[PDB]
């Protein structure tokens, strides 16, 4: 057996992480939106802006998994999963899912009764993977829209 | 003119805040989903897990705007507005949006370049407001599902 160890994230890794945020600049087709550098990522891991796991193989990174803590006035705090990526040459070795499982474990160890994560409708890989658990699609079941409001509109709405 | 004052949420407010929560789950046809208490919440405002703005008129609570800090791998830390409710006898008095501003002023003041929030598809009153700013509908335009996994599911997958 090959040795995937999962390490939780310290800013020491932000280098490795910042690489894996650029690779993915290719694949989900939103390649120019890169404004979180390696340095800014450190300070974010430090100030607990973000959390994560890295899976390494031997001495190389193979995949990551970022996640922050979010709140819901019905249950209290929960976990949201942000990135869940595997460098190409390591997909379908089940790392994919394992990094998803340590966060599940972290949710148990913390009593958190809610994971969330968002995914593209056409991204049938992630659905394929996510299909191997019991989850609810919030969008369909309850009809929630997520609205976003980017920076230019953030400003003029404040400077009215 | 009629006076509405907005002060930032202190742990001391959790009493008034838990009440409005119930009114909103009541309105959003989800009375059961709520397990959070004032005193549980009372810890949660101390711990900077949630932030808010309460609207009082005289000494009566009217509405509230609660929110947490989310992280996108692409744009660092941004704000997510979880819950925004006005008591019924205080609608049509503008708070709706005003409470909403102090969160965009803050997002500006902290230099944050995205501001997300969600609503049900049938709550056309809530969209009625939201249509007076520039927002993207990430569900309908880009087809984003949000997958939830509750606690029963979280344990069953973490316990493999």
Curated annotation (Swiss-Prot), chains A, B:
Residues 4-159 form the N-acetyltransferase domain. One of its GO terms (molecular function) is N-acetyltransferase activity. Acetyl-CoA binds at residues 84-86, 92-97, 123-126, 130-133. InterPro entries: Acyl_CoA_acyltransferase (IPR016181), Diverse_Substrate_AcTransf (IPR051016), GNAT_dom (IPR000182). It comes from the Eukaryota. Its EC number is 2.3.1.-. It catalyses: S-(2-aminoethyl)-L-cysteine + acetyl-CoA = S-(2-acetamidoethyl)-L-cysteine + CoA + H(+); O-(2-aminoethyl)-L-serine + acetyl-CoA = O-(2-acetamidoethyl)-L-serine + CoA + H(+); S-(2-aminoethyl)-homocysteine + acetyl-CoA = S-(2-acetamidoethyl)-homocysteine + CoA + H(+). Pfam families: Acetyltransf_1 (PF00583). Keywords: Acyltransferase, Transferase. Belongs to the acetyltransferase family. Homodimer. Catalyzes the N-acetylation of the amino acid thialysine (S-(2-aminoethyl)-L-cysteine), a L-lysine analog with the 4-methylene group substituted with a sulfur. Substrate specificity: thialysine > O-(2-aminoethyl)-L-serine > S-(2-aminoethyl)-D,L-homocysteine. Does not act on polyamines, such as spermidine and spermine, nor on diamines putrescine and cadaverine. This is Thialysine N-epsilon-acetyltransferase. It comes from Caenorhabditis elegans.
